[PDB]
Design a protein around this ligand. Structure first.
Ligand SMILES: CCCCCCCC(=O)OC[C@H](COP(=O)(O)O[C@@H]1[C@H](O)[C@H](O)[C@@H](OP(=O)(O)O)[C@H](OP(=O)(O)O)[C@H]1O)OC(=O)CCCCCCC
Ligand SMILES: CCCCCCCC(=O)OC[C@H](COP(=O)(O)O[C@@H]1[C@H](O)[C@H](O)[C@@H](OP(=O)(O)O)[C@H](OP(=O)(O)O)[C@H]1O)OC(=O)CCCCCCC
Ligand SMILES: Nc1ncnc2c1ncn2[C@@H]1O[C@H](COP(=O)(O)OP(=O)(O)OP(=O)(O)O)[C@@H](O)[C@H]1O
Ligand SMILES: Nc1ncnc2c1ncn2[C@@H]1O[C@H](COP(=O)(O)OP(=O)(O)OP(=O)(O)O)[C@@H](O)[C@H]1O
Ligand SMILES: [Mg+2]
Ligand SMILES: [Mg+2]
Lengths: 704, 704
């Protein structure tokens, strides 16, 4: 799996630096760079509100059809309707994925985290992957599964960004010339960062939470001119989302519009800072670190198991998805018949019990005047279950045994649902599993505290999310703009830090674990302490030698180095040997396809390559080597490789440490890094495969 | 003015990489790195609450003494008391600055913005500079000047961080050995970033606003392991600030405790999204961009004028400060006698008029039942004037002429007060000057809008602050956590973007303008479009040649290159010439002071330099060259410069563009950057002075 070309070519023929164009062209580029950051936000807002409209309508008219048979004391008919509707929606949402785009499974972040690190993950931002991600997300979260549209919205935002960047689908591009400036690999990284923050803001209705999510976790080369377009895109997202909530008020769109603007609003509690509430807040942090470590350690084993079932065919995936949906629906209907009914309390002031699709003290098998504390949490859409656990001013609503049963159910569903072949997510199961033990500790303290148990559920959700994803700033800002409680922001990040620096003492993160399972070559930020005692010359003394071309290279050597080798960049020498730089494989296949062949070893002028090539044709990667067949009489001609050479590559000397070379490699971009000698002017090329610690430790095992 | 040594030395003798120490030492380092990030937050919270306690007590007992003579219809006695108390407080706050630490003047950011870019700004984070910054900030903002403790709190946080880093004041350091790990220049940059975000969070009571302020504007080398300590420090700051607000409730600390937790709370408005309120919000943005551009262009001329008065002696500074305070007090008392009294309205529901030190419809010369709309804004501490302009549910409280008079006064005071020799600031004058025209447009629209005029004042303040400082994310998060209005966050950054991308079309920022006035060599992020068509070899073909030392260099050449040259790093050769790397001046003076002299040209072993030096002694920069006198008989001995050489420097070749060399230079750190030839193995050193565009354009003026 290859990498991406971030390094700028400084030749005049390529016109890579956009400031060096004309004035009309820099006007058009500076207008299109903001028009696309507007349209990414506009379309991510429209598509997330379409997902929310369809999901709320489907889950509402499923739960109303369940409650109509609940109210007539027909429990088995309601169970058959529930399991049948869940099985049909999960069947559609996994048939589309396993038969039309098998890369749509899973969240999408653990890959966009690797695309923005330079790894060219293939077939990830297509058009059919976006459409089956949308329909699979609708049919998967409207089937009551323990997933969430939280994750897939990041991947849908990235696909919207890339389809706007290349001007449509991969084979139906519009031939607008003004989109020729975004054919690079730096503009794609900028657009996909805008789309990923656009997706996080569409998921959580939090603008700068999404900006900080793309800043801290997903992207890795942050620019201050990128911080102003990500800003604009999350702004247009949350404007479009709140405007289409406000238009669909008063039931003009059926359901979807009885919910409000901020999602899990608990901004009415006025949390205080008592000194006997230091012990339970650090207990929330310590237990969130331990449970996030244990949850990562078990989800690693579960995904290792699911990698065996995914290779046994395209029908074992569908059977696994339907079995997970069947077990989910059977548990979510049969488990609330174990918790006994507790009577209402008039000190809570909310209406209990309640019959309908909404939360707030639901009953389904209790007599009149009682309410079921399990069916408040189960038998509901998961957007309302977490509103029931974040319920301000509800002392002792849920018992200890019912919260234990809900916790022990959702810590199982979070393991077995993530990794199935439907578009899943990982924010919502951790939010539910964290709110469970947060309100468990809230009910366990009781009168010896002053923070509300709903805020203990918020602290439990944030503490498990930190202990399982190792994020600090994005989680505190996201929980601020989910909960609207500004006075909770100190204590809710005092709990994130204890959760993260307890969870770091046991395991890795979960994105690093999913990146390690998928084998993606992610370059870590800081080098190891043993990388400083190893030099680059010792690294190239354990490698095959560099293959090079000269400047006016014969066609036979170009064809030989293209057929026999898989390398994507070759240094150019002159055979007094003067190094020129690197030339890419993508330009070797271009001069072979263009029939730019010379008779003698003449080095050309500039106007010949201006007449042959154009700056737009040099960035089209729509080529392969198999279709071109060179005549064996014209394999003795000559190709002038001078005007296509990246004549200013980044070089290190053969005594630099591997640590400093890795720091340069990751800080600049740099698919390729030459190695010139200290005083054959090239003695090796370092790439991403050579600077990862797992490959270096296999060659020199006496280091660690 | 020199630079800082960020580049890590990879030798075993220095022990710069902290992971390569022992296990006990890495435990002690990982404990102290968080203990200092705790103590920075704890002490910045305690010192900002001491500033707030003293400022509120002094300004309260000054305004009560003014109001006691206002209520007895004695206006001239109140004017004499007001002008005398302001003149005494400004006299103390400028005498301390001009006679004890003249670097305490001005905000503090435009320098911490340059210290974190590597420029070693001298005498900036001392102990007397911190103490006179504290007392000057108290005596300057309690004198009613148009400044603010918003800025100086960044510099006080940075000084607290550096005094904790070096273990006390600059000549009273404690001799604790466990503070030897923070003697580097990377730990100082990390600590000062924690202290700067600590200061912004202590100023605005906004944690992640301060984190994003240190992320976007102040610091320039952001690390994800730094994002977790800045987090902790702003957390402890806002916890200590809110706890010492809550302890000082019910008047146990005199005043300071009748204000609340969040400062300018306007979270009761429920802003809507009408479609006829797109024209005035973009008018707020356009006028904020134009007024921020014009305010920068005039403050540049005013600071150019003040540079003449500052050089005419230490008494012209005091006369300028007292004249500014006199003009301020005469205007703030004499201007409200021009606005006529308007009667009360019962539809506003707040108590009008009010007599006291607080805001909310103040009267001072109106009869009973009326109120003065200018003295609501003037004659009050500026922390309450902006609460009066951000007043939710007050339609048409201030007229048009009174708001025009307040605007035309504060746009003059913001020019003439910033730059005087007291510890000033720049957030509060822009907040006041922006709220003025924000509520002016709110009163000008009237019934043709639905957003409250207090929210138009918030939009005007944010739009002028963006048009004059060119910040986006930090301003929207800071205005969120000042105003507590989460539903204002979309429109309040839709106005910041129009303000910033109108203001960018005219001028620079204001930090770049103050950095350009002080002549500090700030390295910009992206290179110019002409820097790609210039190579490093052409840069070194217009420079004096590199001076070098050999490896076992005689003492006479070391003394000659230390006396005759001012360079701080010399390449080491061997005269077959094998490059070793760079050696610093700070180690040349160390081997000259240590008397590590050899008789012959023997290259030593490792154990000799282990016996002479220690890893702590090699980082002590407490030396100068004038005190050491070498005997002329021992100037023919030899110094082994091998084991102190930075043997892995960052090298480029002599055909790299200046653009790519600048990108490497700024992305890695790098005080010094060698230039090795393509195929005398060194042909130059590039530093910060060579890669700035202003120095390159003076040598090759045919480029632009
Ligand atoms: C409503 C919200 C905003 C509304 C306004 C919509 C436009 C808007 O929000 O920003 C305006 C845009 C700014 O462009 P933007 O900041 O995205 O682009 C960066 C900017 O040009 C910097 O000045 C560049 O650095 P330098 O100079 O090389 O040092 C940087 O180069 P690099 O990072 O690539 O190295 C650029 O990426 O351009 C204008 O100011 C002129 C107005 C024409 C744009 C009009 C397009 C609609
Ligand atoms: C609110 C409570 C939270 C604070 C208290 C808890 C302390 C706390 O919040 O962080 C814990 C601390 C994390 O240290 P911290 O994250 O600051 O340090 C980074 C961390 O060690 C990374 O793993 C390093 O990267 P790598 O590994 O090289 O890849 C990185 O290296 P570099 O960036 O330098 O290159 C380090 O800077 O680790 C402990 O368990 C120390 C015992 C804690 C004792 C401290 C007690 C105060
Ligand atoms: N002439 C050469 N060009 C490029 N790589 C080379 C060459 N000679 C040896 N290598 C080494 O061969 C290994 C495999 O290289 P590979 O074919 O993956 O290059 P690549 O596909 O361009 O790498 P990537 O695209 O992942 O940056 C690398 O570790 C590289 O160091
Ligand atoms: N041997 C040398 N070492 C360092 N700089 C040199 C040398 N020879 C020439 N120069 C040049 O002389 C100019 C002035 O260098 P200066 O004395 O400011 O170095 P410096 O003080 O170490 O720089 P800084 O500390 O700002 O990084 C620089 O532009 C540098 O390029
Ligand atoms: Mg490859
Ligand atoms: Mg110097």
């Amino acid at each position: 799996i290859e990498s991406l070309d971030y390094e700028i070519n400084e030749n005049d023929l390529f016109k890579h630096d956009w400031r060096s164009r004309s004035k009309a062209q820099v006007f058009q580029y500076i207008f299109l760079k903001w028009t696309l950051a507007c349209l990414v936000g506009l379309f991510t807002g429209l598509i997330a509100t379409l997902i929310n409209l369809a999901v709320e309508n489907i889950a509402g008219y499923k739960l109303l059809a369940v409650g109509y048979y609940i109210a007539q004391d027909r429990f088995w008919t309601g169970l058959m309707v529930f399991t049948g509707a869940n099985l049909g929606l999960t069947l559609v949402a996994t048939v589309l994925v396993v038969y039309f785009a098998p890369t749509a499974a899973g969240p999408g972040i653990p890959e966009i985290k690797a695309y923005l690190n330079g790894i060219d993950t293939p077939n990830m931002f297509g058009f059919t992957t976006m459409m089956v991600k949308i329909v699979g997300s609708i049919g998967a979260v409207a089937a009551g599964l323990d997933l969430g549209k939280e994750g897939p919205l990041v991947h849908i935002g990235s696909c919207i960004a890339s389809l706007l960047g290349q001007g449509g689908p991969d084979n139906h591009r519009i031939k607008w010339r003004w989109l020729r400036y975004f054919n690079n690999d730096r503009d794609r990284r900028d657009l996909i960062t805008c789309g990923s923050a656009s997706g996080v803001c569409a998921a959580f209705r939090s603008p700068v939470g999404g900006v900080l999510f793309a800043l801290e976790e997903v992207a890795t080369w942050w620019r201050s001119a990128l911080l102003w377009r990500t800003f604009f895109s999350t702004a247009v997202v949350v404007v479009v989302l709140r405007a289409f909530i406000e238009i669909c008020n008063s039931g003009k769109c059926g359901l979807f519009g009885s919910g409000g603007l901020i999602m899990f609003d608990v901004s009415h509690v006025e949390v205080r800072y008592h000194a006997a509430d230091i012990i339970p807040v650090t207990l929330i942090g310590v237990f969130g670190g331990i449970l996030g470590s244990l949850y990562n350690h078990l989800l690693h084993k579960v995904l290792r198991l699911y990698n065996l079932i995914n290779q046994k065919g395209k029908i074992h995936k569908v059977l696994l998805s339907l079995g997970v949906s069947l077990f989910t629906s059977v548990c979510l209907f049969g488990l609330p018949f174990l918790a006994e009914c507790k009577p209402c309390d008039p000190s809570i002031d909310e209406i209990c019990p309640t019959n309908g699709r909404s939360g707030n003290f639901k009953q389904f098998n209790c007599p009149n005047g009682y309410y079921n504390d399990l069916s408040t949490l189960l038998l509901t859409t998961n957007d309302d279950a977490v509103r029931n656990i974040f319920s301000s001013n509800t002392p002792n609503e849920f018992g200890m045994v019912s919260l234990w049963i809900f916790f022990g159910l959702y810590c199982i569903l979070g393991l077995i649902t993530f990794g199935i072949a439907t578009p899943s997510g990982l924010f919502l199961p951790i939010i539910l599993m964290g709110s469970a033990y947060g309100r468990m500790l809230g009910t366990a303290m009781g009168s010896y505290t002053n923070i509300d148990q709903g805020l203990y559920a918020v602290l439990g959700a944030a503490s498990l999310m930190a202990g399982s994803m190792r994020m600090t700033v994005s989680l505190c800002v996201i929980f601020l703009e989910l909960t609207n409680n500004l006075l909770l922001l100190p204590i809710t990040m005092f709990v994130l830090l204890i959760a993260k620096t307890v969870g770091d003492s046991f395991n890795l993160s979960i994105y690093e674990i999913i990146l390690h399972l998928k084998g993606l070559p992610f370059l870590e930020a800081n080098p190891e302490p043993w990388m400083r005692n190893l030099t680059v010359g010792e690294l190239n003394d354990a490698k095959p030698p560099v293959v090079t071309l000269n400047g006016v290279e014969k066609v036979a050597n170009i064809v030989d180095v293209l057929r026999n080798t898989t390398h994507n960049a070759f240094p150019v020498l002159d055979g007094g040997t003067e190094l020129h730089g690197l030339i890419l494989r993508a330009h070797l296949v271009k001069v072979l396809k263009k029939r730019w062949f010379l008779n003698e070893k003449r080095r050309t002028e500039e106007w010949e390559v201006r007449e042959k090539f154009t700056p737009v044709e040099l960035a089209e990667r729509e080529d392969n080597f198999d279709d071109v067949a060179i005549t064996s009489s014209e394999m003795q001609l000559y190709v002038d490789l001078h005007p296509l050479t990246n004549t200013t590559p980044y070089t290190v000397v053969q005594s630099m440490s591997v640590a400093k070379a890795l720091v340069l490699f990751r800080s600049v971009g740099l698919r390729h890094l030459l190695v010139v000698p200290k005083i054959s002017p090239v003695i090796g090329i370092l790439t991403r495969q050579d600077l990862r610690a797992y490959n270096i430790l296999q060659a020199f095992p006496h280091l660690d």
